[PDB]
């Protein structure tokens, strides 16, 4: 306790949240280009399992 | 099944249509109770207001 | 007159609660004022609150028949002379008597000049008028009393301050008050220590406020002028059982709305807009335009944006927030209700545009 | 200034004191007899709470007494303007001693207030006070002490300024009936007098571990805690469930009363914290669910208007509602709809039985019995 | 055919539940509506007699 | 009088088991403050769940409160309570419900208010 | 006549809110605020935006100082937010990218050497 | 015991500039892993009870 210790303790937490707060938005970013080449993906397997329903069955 | 079609089709109407008015009248049952007290009230606290 | 007076007996004071109509649509819709109540002014600075006084006296001098008094307390000589001169040329200097104690004072003058301008202010009552009484800054009142309270050598106390803090402060706040013959009102700038609500002074003089406007520089830089904050912004009079219960729910309407629209805002910063559902862009579309339409033209102010002043009725601000909340007026843009006024004016903009 | 009766005096507190409020009289039942803390921080309630419960005592019989303590002089004329406009001024004495008044009258004021409320607790009737602040006296006291040059103690508090309080709160007692008879002179034979106290304290940003807050609690027999955070959420009177007790517990509820409510406060404290961890996700979910929709619902009912008070009668049938289901049913934008309702039929149709429980404890299977079949009642033909 | 029936009887059955809420609505607003007016006249009255 | 000369070496150990389990969670509650529950590894999430059990377990109704939780009071022999405790650290009732071990006497008490939720 | 005044106060650890700098604060008409961690990082001198304000502000200006410094101190402010957040994100967007290396431009522009003061000529056109 | 406690300050020293990672043990490389696994056993060895005394010989003996 004292009002040293407690600052010091508030500006660590401050820092916490500035990591966070940066993860985040990384994080945001990284999602919608991972769905892009989540998007990107369909064609093959989506022409494949014609290809394969025509022939099998 | 065109005989079976028909009988669900008019018991089917038989039931909405009239229960559309039943549930109607269950709000204009509880609208009228509800205004019964709306008056009351309003006439009761002229009576504090007069005392006061 | 004496500046030592006695407060007014138990049995002078109004056997009424009326509210003091200052036009502004922010105030008078979020954070309405008492006649004969106390107003804390809670904003920083390069927000306006010169220009928000200069409107408040001029409006409460022309739309009513009362006059106004400004005490110094302790702040800048710079800001004094210019305001003094912000004053005279905008024809408000003659509706306003000016009592100055400032930093360069020993510490009885910054202790006795708020007492000077409030038995001004209580002449003025006497004659029957409503009466506005500015402070500049409250907590400068407290500190002057700490100076003196030291320099005669009395215990200290809570944090620092004098023993007869509460003391000192409620025999100057119990004297602006609304009496049978008149009522004095006051709009007092406060200054919070260390960013600390529990400071004794702070804590100490939030007891006497009703009323409390923060202005917020934010506000200011999207443009919107006044620059109150609708969410922090606070009035005790904000209750159905003394102003209604339409002025009452339609204020918290819009405070909900815009204290949704606050984080709707943030989760469109991060994921952007169209991630959004549809009910909360419906949302984000009138929060946009009511937070336009709590700007105002004042009087003052013409001589920045031209316009000519508007003095706004209360009864139109409830009538232009329902409608724009009870999803009427969706049909005509957010930039035709900007520093427009009424809404009967809002949608004349709207017309031409 | 006089010593409060000796521990050979007292007796147990056994009568209750009905506030207008579910949620107190509920969970923190007021016996005649008790000191019980009004705490929390400011613009809460609390003065609200407090002459809710002097405006109930308009029929019951209880002189009542309202003492302000560095009060506005406007809030204190317009809380008698209230007290006027209800009545109840006709049964209150209002010893004020307004925030302009000097600290030597702000200081001495609760003692009056006691001296006169002594006076009916030594004739064998039944007196009710309230401080309005015992955090404004105790300031008025530091300034009083201060000037004279004493040492202060902590938060520059001087050391007495537990006495100060203790000597005062330890007069609301209730005496025995040998006590009335003796003090007296044998002419009231029989009758136990009883001096209630509901002292109001203010914390700094909900601090409830200063040291005046605890010196009171310290002193008082239980606290209403009211909360900020749950105030500005619509939930009012905000009594927070897990701070405030009632250390003469259910001694001083009527026999009905007590048996409804049983650890319900005990039951919205779990559901509370509870609430704090399913905020994200939980699991055993119906039982924690079914568990969180009955604690909601009983919040969205334990919430209540300023200036309406409601007989034991009707607090009663309303728990009973909320205790024997009845309300899964109903949403929480009923919940009003059914309490209105509720009552007004109950005021229609049964106002014998209405007329008895609130004359009695009133609690048996014949009357549990009677409940069941007026809630199935209203239940099923009556609409809302 | 049968089916078309089975939502017509729905469709009645959820403009029933709209019009009960919107009947109610209406209801209470106009027991606020005039138990205000109620007070309003009554205060004005009790003032009337002070003055007297 | 904690000492395992005078308790006993089961008894001690008992409650030293105790007393580290606890503070081993006092240790975690900032982070899962911070970061939630779901970022602490396996091994400190079962941890945390004993540590709460143990929380619970130590409540006790008394007989002179019954005038205000109106359930009757429990009387829990020595011999009976560091047993209990055993079994809850060591794990033979790692799959109970936390409120099962509120307010109870014993650990046969707990298993048996498990049945009723 | 005029005097104009430039009083200095030392803080310790860089808190602000000391007594005595809280109510030098309290009388001034602004304040620059050296930063200690600008000025070990070489940049030099210290000054802080964001931190730091004159509350008379342009009134006082050179027009056409006024005119070529209007974005520059919120720049900055921004610009030293978004370097705080760069540690943390590679694969930055261009578009922050710009802004991230303008920044750092100007932020490489504003430091002097110790004796070398500059007319309002030279400032401007540097600003330019 | 000169020359042995010199390998336990420094093992206590890695370990106590290592412990901010014990709460995010599993992301660690494992050539750190052996450095904190290192300490926490060291740290373990030194607990002793109370009114047993090592000779010198015995605390010479662990610390090897
Ligand atoms: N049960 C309630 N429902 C709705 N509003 C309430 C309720 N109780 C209190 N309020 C509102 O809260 C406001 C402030 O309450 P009150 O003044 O009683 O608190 P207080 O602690 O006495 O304030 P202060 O501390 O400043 O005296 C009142 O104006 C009242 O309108
Ligand atoms: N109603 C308004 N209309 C136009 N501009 C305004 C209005 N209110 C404030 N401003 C602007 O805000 C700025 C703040 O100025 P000033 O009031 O002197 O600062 P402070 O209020 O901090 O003393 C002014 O330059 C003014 O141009
Ligand atoms: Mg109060």
């Given at each position: 306790a004292?009002?040293?210790?407690?600052?010091?303790?508030?500006?660590?937490?401050?820092?916490?949240?500035?990591?966070?707060?940066?993860?985040?938005?990384?994080?945001?970013?990284?999602?919608?280009?991972?769905?892009?080449?989540?998007?990107?993906?369909?064609?093959?397997?989506?022409?494949?399992?014609?290809?394969?329903?025509?022939?099998?069955? | 099944d065109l005989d079976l079609a028909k009988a669900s089709a008019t018991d089917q109407l038989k039931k909405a249509k009239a229960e559309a008015q039943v549930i109607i009248e269950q709000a204009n049952k509880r609208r009228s109770q509800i205004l019964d007290e709306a008056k009351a009230e309003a006439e009761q606290e002229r009576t504090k207001i007069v005392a006061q | 007159w004496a500046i030592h007076r006695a407060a007014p007996s138990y049995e002078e004071l109004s056997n009424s609660q009326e509210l003091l109509e200052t036009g502004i649509k922010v105030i008078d819709l979020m954070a309405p004022f008492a006649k004969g109540g106390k107003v804390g002014l809670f904003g920083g600075a390069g927000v306006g609150k010169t220009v928000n006084m200069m409107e408040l006296i001029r409006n409460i001098a022309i739309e009513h028949s009362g006059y106004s008094v400004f005490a110094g307390v302790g702040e800048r000589t710079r800001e004094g002379n210019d305001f003094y001169h912000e004053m005279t040329d905008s024809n408000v200097i003659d509706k306003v008597s000016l009592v100055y104690g400032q930093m360069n004072e020993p510490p009885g003058n910054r202790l006795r000049v708020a007492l000077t301008g409030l038995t001004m202010a209580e002449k003025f009552r006497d004659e029957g008028r409503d009466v506005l009484l500015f402070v500049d800054n409250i907590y400068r009142y407290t500190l002057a009393g700490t100076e003196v309270s030291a320099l005669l050598g009395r215990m200290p106390s809570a944090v620092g301050y004098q023993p007869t803090l509460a003391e000192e402060m409620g025999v100057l706040q119990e004297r602006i008050t609304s009496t049978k013959t008149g009522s004095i009102t006051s709009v007092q700038a406060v200054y919070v220590p260390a960013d600390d609500l529990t400071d004794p002074s702070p804590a100490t003089t939030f007891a006497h406020l009703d009323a409390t406007v923060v202005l917020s520089r934010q506000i200011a830089s999207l443009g919107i002028y006044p620059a109150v904050d609708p969410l922090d912004s606070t009035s005790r009079q904000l209750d159905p059982l003394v102003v209604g219960q339409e002025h009452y729910d339609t204020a918290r309407g819009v405070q909900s709305i815009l204290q949704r629209y606050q984080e709707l805002k943030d989760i469109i910063a991060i994921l952007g807009m169209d991630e959004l559902s549809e009910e909360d862009k419906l949302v984000?579309?009138?929060?946009?335009k009511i937070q336009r339409f709590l700007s105002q033209p004042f009087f003052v102010a013409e001589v920045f944006t031209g316009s000519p002043g508007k003095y706004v009725s209360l009864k139109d601000t409830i009538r232009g927030f329902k409608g724009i909340m009870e999803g009427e007026y969706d049909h005509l843009p957010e930039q035709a209700f900007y520093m427009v006024g009424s809404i009967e004016e809002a949608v004349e903009k709207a017309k031409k545009l | 200034e006089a010593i409060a009766p000796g521990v050979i005096e007292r007796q147990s507190v056994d009568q209750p004191v009905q506030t207008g409020y579910?949620?107190?009289?509920?969970?923190?039942?007021?016996?005649?007899?008790?000191?019980?803390?009004?705490?929390?921080?400011?613009?809460?309630?609390?003065?609200?709470?407090?002459?809710?419960?002097?405006?109930?005592?308009?029929?019951?019989?209880?002189?009542?007494?309202?003492?302000?303590?560095?009060?506005?002089?406007?809030?204190?004329?317009?809380?008698?303007?209230?007290?006027?406009?209800?009545?109840?001024?006709?049964?209150?004495?209002?010893?004020?001693?307004?925030?302009?008044?000097?600290?030597?009258l702000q200081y001495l004021a609760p003692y009056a207030g006691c001296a006169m409320g002594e006076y009916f607790r030594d004739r064998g009737e039944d007196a009710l006070i309230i401080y309005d602040d015992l955090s404004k006296q105790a300031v008025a006291y530091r300034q009083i002490s201060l000037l004279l040059r004493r040492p202060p103690g902590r938060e520059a508090f001087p050391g007495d300024v537990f006495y100060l309080h203790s000597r005062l709160l330890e007069?609301?007692?209730?005496?025995?009936?040998?006590?009335?008879?003796?003090?007296?002179?044998?002419?009231?034979?029989?009758?136990?007098?009883?001096?209630?106290?509901?002292?109001?304290?203010?914390?700094?940003?909900?601090?409830?571990?200063?040291?005046?807050?605890?010196?009171?609690?310290?002193?008082?027999?239980?606290?209403?805690?009211?909360?900020?955070?749950?105030?500005?959420?619509?939930?009012?009177?905000?009594?927070?469930?897990?701070?405030?007790?009632?250390?003469?517990?259910?001694?001083?509820?009527?026999?009905?009363?007590?048996?409804?409510?049983?650890?319900?406060?005990?039951?919205?404290?779990?559901?509370?914290?509870?609430?704090?961890?399913?905020?994200?996700?939980?699991?055993?979910?119906?039982?924690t669910r079914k568990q969180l929709d009955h604690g909601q619902k009983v919040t969205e009912l334990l919430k209540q208007k300023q200036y309406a008070p409601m007989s034991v009668a009707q607090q009663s049938l309303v728990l009973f509602a909320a205790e024997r289901g009845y309300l899964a049913d109903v949403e929480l934008s009923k919940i009003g709809s059914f309490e209105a309702a509720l009552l007004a039929y109950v005021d229609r149709d049964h106002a014998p039985l209405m007329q008895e429980i609130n004359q009695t404890g009133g609690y048996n299977d014949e009357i549990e019995g009677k409940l069941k079949g007026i809630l199935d009642s209203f239940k099923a033909t009556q609409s809302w």
């Open positions: 004292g009002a040293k210790d407690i600052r010091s303790k508030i500006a660590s937490v401050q820092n916490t949240q500035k990591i966070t707060k940066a993860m985040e938005m990384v994080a945001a970013s990284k999602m919608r280009k991972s769905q892009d080449r989540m998007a990107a993906s369909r064609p093959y397997a989506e022409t494949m399992r014609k290809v394969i329903g025509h022939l099998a069955h | - | 984000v579309a009138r929060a946009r | 579910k949620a107190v009289d509920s969970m923190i039942p007021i016996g005649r007899g008790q000191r019980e803390l009004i705490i929390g921080d400011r613009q809460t309630g609390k003065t609200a709470l407090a002459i809710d419960a002097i405006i109930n005592q308009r029929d019951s019989g209880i002189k009542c007494i309202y003492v302000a303590i560095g009060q506005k002089a406007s809030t204190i004329s317009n809380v008698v303007r209230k007290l006027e406009e209800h009545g109840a001024l006709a049964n209150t004495i209002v010893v004020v001693a307004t925030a302009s008044e000097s600290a030597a007069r609301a007692a209730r005496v025995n009936a040998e006590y009335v008879e003796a003090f007296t002179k044998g002419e009231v034979k029989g009758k136990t007098g009883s001096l209630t106290a509901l002292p109001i304290i203010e914390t700094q940003a909900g601090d409830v571990s200063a040291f005046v807050p605890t010196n009171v609690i310290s002193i008082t027999d239980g606290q209403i805690f009211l909360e900020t955070n749950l105030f500005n959420a619509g939930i009012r009177p905000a009594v927070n469930p897990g701070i405030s007790v009632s250390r003469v517990g259910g001694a001083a509820q009527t026999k009905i009363m007590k048996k409804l409510s049983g650890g319900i406060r005990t039951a919205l404290a779990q559901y509370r914290e509870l609430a704090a961890f399913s905020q994200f996700a939980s699991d055993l979910d119906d039982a």
